Amino acid sequence: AQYEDGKQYTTLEKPVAGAPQVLEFFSFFCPHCYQFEEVLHISDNVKKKLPEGVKMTKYHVNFMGGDLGKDLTQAWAVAMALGVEDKVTVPLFEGVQKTQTIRSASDIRDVFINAGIKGEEYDAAWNSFVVKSLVAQQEKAAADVQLRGVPAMFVNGKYQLNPQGMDTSNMDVFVQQYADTVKYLSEK
Template identity: 25%
Template sequence: MQMLRRLLCTAALLTLSGVVAAAPAAPTAPKEGVQYRVLPQKMDTPAGKQVEVIEFFAYYCPHCNVFEPLLADWVKKQGDNIVFKRVHVAGGARVLPQQRLFYALDALGLVGQYHTKAFAAMHQQGARFANDEEVIDWAVKSGIDRARFVDAYNAFGTQAKARRAAAMMNEYRVDHWPMVAIDGRFITSPSMANPEGSPAQTEIEQQQVALQVMDALVEKAKAAKADKK
């Protein structure tokens, strides 16, 4: 099962070997069909100057775990340029408790406080989050009020968002993760941003290159919004 889960995550060929001082330079103008792709039909996104950025991720995914702190820093640097959202991907009955954990945290306004702790629980502390009881026990031990968490975990809205995630994966053509959608039309990921022959040598380097590609796509989306005025 663990091997299957790893295969479902983005296919990073090189394992993490440590933080590097600087990432290899990404193309100043990423190429469509190489470092990113364009959806056949643009998804609806919020109006205004801000660019919507959606990360498709899974708590069980080791690559998402590595990407999380780098992505969090990138989101902070983007500031008001973007509206950032996360979608926990679907994956059957064993993944559903993890989805509901994320959407319960989101409903309670606790993602900022507990998102990285959930990753740490799975990738450093041996949690599996394979059933409701394990998720609820972890939440309570982590300091969340049991009644509030259980209500949010079982809420119709939480279950609806988990179902909606599967539909969004189809709409955005998500076939590996972490994957990032920008402005409802551009799709990229660390593996896409680093095609064969890329100078990136470690997983973190690949992810840093992906963030540079994301920078370029956000600017591209902002320019398109400005042209519509």
């Protein structure tokens, strides 16, 4: 074919029922995730090519950056509950990896305050049980698919994107190939 198992994607030996249609995993500690987010805008270019009536989910993971890693997964859960993913994603990445000014939960909280979420509203969300389950969901979905590395994309719990098997000479070309692959897998 032109799209072969083991080449632009791999297939899960243990498929995952009821999974989100397009499921992406990242870490604010993950260097390629930074690339994927602010240089390549993968999430965004995938969205643009998906059929629709298809929803896109993105989750943070715990296995990078120890204690601060977990804090970031809760903070992402807060982002998700308040719907402020778009206002914090970039300063969260740059605070962990570029400026290195995120060193504690409090520094994470600063990013939200500066992004305009209110302390009262952030602390309330942070501590809410809706956020607890949303953390639980994030962990469960990573658990369901044997996740040991990020970035990672899964399409209906049975296909996993394999970017090592795509050309990287041209970034735009890598992105199109990536998204088209998601689209092909979407339709499968």
